[PDB]
Design a protein around this ligand. Structure first.
Ligand SMILES: [Zn+2]
Lengths: 233, 207, 167, 68, 161, 157
């Protein structure tokens, strides 16, 4: 739990959504289990996609697989995280914006996937890309049994600034700032009303004489779930 | 829940007397308003259908409501919504099925409220605008194929008002003959037969 | 040389030379098959791909290969043969003296002409082999009309300089 | 007619099911061929012959049914 | 690219048992056929005798002695045919019992060898042939009941005349 | 050629009387093979125990530990051989019952020739299996005698 300090400053970089465009032989990707309209779409753009994973059909000593992923737009990549996959030998990651051989460049060839997760924090300078290339190779003596390989969560700035543009049709900053401000005001009203309903919910709890032993006894009821949901919101 | 119905609802509630029929069902109206601020997609047009049916052309309220609808452009919005749902372009000079049925019902209630001095009760501006929309090619394509009863109600509605009869003429197979052959092929039956006979009578009277 | 019948010459990484460099030879079970076996470990592979790197595939399918490990095997590189190649005669008999030689804008081929008119052009860029072996005929109609324009006919020709030209 | 049809379908259902048995038979001929376990191949050839007789008798019944 | 032998005794089990869970299944359905064939032809003879009793009973009192004798001889011959075919049928069902047990304990062998798929296929086939055999059985008992009703009504009208 | 029902059984039962005889042959062979392999292993361990007995007191602690570890590994090999032994003998018992009641089925069909052939095969496999059972049991008894001699000399020293 001490190593959990590997990813810091996650507030300033927004979550990015994923689209599966290419996969390899015996490999698949699954999901692990008008102002208001523009505001809702922008809010949905800034959401963490649910957990997803790669499932491989046939594993062997040196199982070589290739996947391509698209965000739908050139987006700054600032932080990466690959969860631990103890049954794989190594991976490589390359990114590009237009073509694989046009602007493709190698990013990492990591052979330490089995023992620890992959952490690479605060990409400096932040590259921009839209397409992503993954090459993975299985461990020697691998048992041919199915397993999950989560992709992790990827963060960056979808909207690009002029100086971030000059490294490698952008709408003007003012109107984009105005509509995100509108989203902020709307989420402020929503946050106030949701937290307020949570306050009324907690005020709807009958309080006997204070015996916190009974308060702990409540762990071992629909009320707990509804307060959990309200706090979640 | 398609966004176009919710967007049209905000304009629809501007009409006086819309809230009076909207408040009949409190729960669904509250849920719709909650979705607006930030079965359900049928209601933004279903409330309009009820308002059109309850307000006849024999009274000043219905004709005023209809001319305000022309003025603000609700009919253009419902026509382009129908165009997007049916993949049919206008004559330039499973949820989708239920949506098309509700839109056709709204149009039928707008023309003839009783179907759910009436010739000049609807201005010919509606006639010339409805001569440019997507209603005729889409209805023609659907003829060549709940919704069927709504379409028959739309036909008796569009034939009920005299000023609206001329758009039944194709721009060369007549609608009455096509309806007669499909009715014979299908043979619910008495209603289809009666509406087919009424449509044929209206087309013959116009010709 | 085993990869003459390779059906995937147009592939990027499945070219005959790089996969021969990894120490593999074409031994297909049927004509048109891309089956190959190594000369050191004899791992067998089929259904090759244009992206299959020779060293990477040999290492992945045979990390225990001494060729993969860099260990001393019985491999004989082409450079050893090239640096010890026994001089090829311009003619099969090996008696005619060489009048001239050289190269021009296309020095991939080396030409050697004899005094009797026999000229042999080698593919010295590639492995030492005979590429062209011929004799110049002095009774050529073009040569005949060129000599006629200069003024039984007896014509003799001797090559004094050689050059190979290309665009 | 229904009954005869039923046994026609049954013979078709069993002839391929023994053809797959011939396939596994050939596989097992190959597999014990490499390892010289002398006493194996004799009983395996007996396996091959018995399944051949079952194969041939099913073909003859396949023919005779269609006669009827 | 992709890759293109003293076998242990367990593979030999999986192989040897896969030879038998199918061929006992073969002779299982072959018993199911032959048994159905007897249950069909014997039912044909039973329905023939039922029809003979219906026409003889309906024509009672309308024939002479010679006609009654010829009809009664036809009825006796049909009785002997159905009886003998039923005697064959009993030995056919006696054999399909053994075929059922053969496939059941062959599937037990397949489960003992790790070839679970052959075991489940054999067992599901046993239940399928059991359903088919019980269906044709109930058809046979239906026709026997019809024949019994025709014999009792023949005796009743014969007593009446 | 409208075949009767009796000829269908007379031809049909020959399939299982050859197929369960095939299973009985492969189980009998493999059981004989596993018995012979286990008998050879037991003889090898018997030789190891006799050699360990004959070397007692002539080796240091390390060599005694090494030979004891080899004996332990051989014991584990016997355990795995005995497990496959019991499973093979189980399947051979199942095959014996299979061919016996299959030949009984051939008897009740009147196809007695296939039945008697299966019968003679059952007696042949029973005698062969019991023979190599006796050989295995003789090897086990010899191993027990070697172990007793090993314990006697170890206690004596
Ligand atoms: Zn090699």
């Amino acid at each position: 739990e001490g190593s959990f300090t590997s990813l810091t400053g996650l507030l300033e970089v927004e979550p990015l959504h994923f689209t599966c465009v290419s996969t390899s032989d015996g490999t698949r990707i699954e999901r692990d289990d008008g102002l208001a309209l523009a505001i809702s779409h922008a809010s949905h753009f800034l959401q963490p996609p649910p957990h997803q994973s790669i499932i491989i059909e046939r594993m062997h000593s040196g199982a070589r697989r290739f996947v391509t992923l698209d965000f739908g737009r050139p987006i700054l990549l600032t932080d990466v995280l690959i969860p631990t996959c103890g049954d794989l030998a190594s991976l490589s990651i390359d990114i590009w914006t237009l073509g694989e051989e046009v602007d493709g460049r190698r990013l990492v060839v990591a052979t330490d996937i089995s023992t620890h997760s992959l952490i690479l924090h605060d990409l400096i300078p932040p590259p921009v890309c839209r397409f992503m290339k993954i090459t993975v190779i299985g461990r020697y003596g691998s048992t041919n049994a199915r397993a999950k390989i989560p992709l992790g969560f990827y963060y960056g700035h979808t909207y690009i600034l002029p100086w971030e543009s000059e490294l490698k049709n952008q709408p003007e900053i003012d109107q984009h700032l105005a509509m995100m401000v509108a989203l902020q005001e709307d989420i402020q009203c929503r946050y106030n009303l949701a937290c307020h309903r949570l306050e009324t919910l907690l005020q709807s709890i009958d309080l006997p004489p204070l015996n916190s032993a009974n308060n702990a006894q409540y762990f071992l009821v629909e009320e707990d779930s509804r307060v959990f949901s309200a706090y979640q919101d | 829940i398609p966004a176009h119905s919710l967007a049209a609802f905000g304009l629809f509630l501007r009409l006086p007397g819309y809230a009076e029929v909207l408040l009949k069902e409190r729960k669904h109206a509250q849920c719709l308003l909650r979705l607006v601020l930030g079965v359900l997609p049928t209601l933004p047009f279903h409330v309009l259908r009820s308002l059109f049916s309850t307000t006849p052309l024999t009274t000043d309220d219905g004709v005023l409501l209809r001319r305000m609808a022309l003025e603000i452009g609700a009919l253009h919005l419902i026509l382009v919504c129908l165009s997007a749902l049916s993949h049919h372009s206008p004559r330039v000079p499973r949820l989708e099925e239920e949506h098309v049925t509700c839109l056709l019902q709204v149009l039928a209630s707008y023309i003839n409220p009783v179907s759910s001095q009436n010739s000049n009760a609807l201005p010919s501006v509606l006639l010339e605008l409805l001569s440019q929309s997507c209603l005729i090619p889409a209805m023609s394509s659907y003829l060549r194929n709940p919704l069927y009863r709504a379409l028959l109600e739309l036909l008796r509605a569009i034939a009920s008002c005299a000023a609206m009869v001329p758009l039944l003429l194709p721009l060369q197979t007549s609608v009455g003959t096509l309806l007669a052959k499909m009715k014979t092929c299908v043979d619910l039956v008495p209603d289809i037969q009666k509406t087919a006979e009424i449509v044929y009578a209206a087309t013959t009277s116009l010709r | 040389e085993t990869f003459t019948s390779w059906p995937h010459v147009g592939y990027r990484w499945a070219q005959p030379d790089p996969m021969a460099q990894a120490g593999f030879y074409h031994q297909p079970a049927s004509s048109g098959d891309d089956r190959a076996m190594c000369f050191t470990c004899s791992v067998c592979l089929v259904c090759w791909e244009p992206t299959d790197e020779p060293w990477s595939e040999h290492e992945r399918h045979s990390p225990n290969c001494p060729f993969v490990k860099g260990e001393h095997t019985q491999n004989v590189p082409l450079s050893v043969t090239l640096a010890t190649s026994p001089a090829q005669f311009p003619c099969t008999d090996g008696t005619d003296r060489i009048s001239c030689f050289g190269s021009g804008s296309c020095p991939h081929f080396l030409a050697a002409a004899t005094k009797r008119g026999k000229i042999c052009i080698w593919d010295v860029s590639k492995l030492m082999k005979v590429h062209l072996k011929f004799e110049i005929n002095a009774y050529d109609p073009a040569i005949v009309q060129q000599l006629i324009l200069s003024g039984a006919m007896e014509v003799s020709l001797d090559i004094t300089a050689l050059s190979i030209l290309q665009q | 007619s229904r009954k005869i049809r039923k046994q026609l379908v049954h013979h078709k259902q069993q002839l391929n099911l023994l053809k797959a048995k011939q396939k596994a038979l050939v596989e097992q001929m190959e597999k014990e061929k490499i390892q010289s376990n002398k006493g194996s191949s004799y009983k395996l050839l007996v396996e091959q012959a018995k399944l051949k007789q079952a194969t041939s008798k099913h073909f003859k019944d396949l023919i005779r049914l269609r006669r009827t | 690219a992709v890759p293109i032998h003293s076998l242990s005794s367990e593979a030999l089990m999986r192989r040897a048992v896969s030879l038998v869970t199918d061929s006992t299944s073969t002779f299982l359905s072959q018993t199911t056929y032959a048994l159905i064939e007897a249950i069909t032809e014997y039912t044909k003879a039973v329905y023939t005798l039922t029809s003979l009793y219906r026409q003889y009973t309906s024509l009672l009192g309308k024939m002479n002695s010679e006609e009654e004798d010829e009809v009664w001889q036809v009825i006796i011959g049909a009785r002997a045919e159905m009886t003998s075919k039923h005697q064959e049928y009993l030995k056919l069902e006696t054999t399909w019992m053994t075929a059922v047990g053969l496939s059941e304990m062959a599937a037990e062998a397949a489960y003992q060898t790790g070839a679970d798929q052959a075991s489940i296929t054999a067992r599901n086939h046993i239940q399928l042939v059991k359903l088919q055999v019980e269906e044709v059985h109930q058809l046979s008992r239906k026709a026997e009941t019809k024949l019994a009703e025709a014999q009792i009504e023949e005796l009743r009208q014969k007593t009446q005349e």
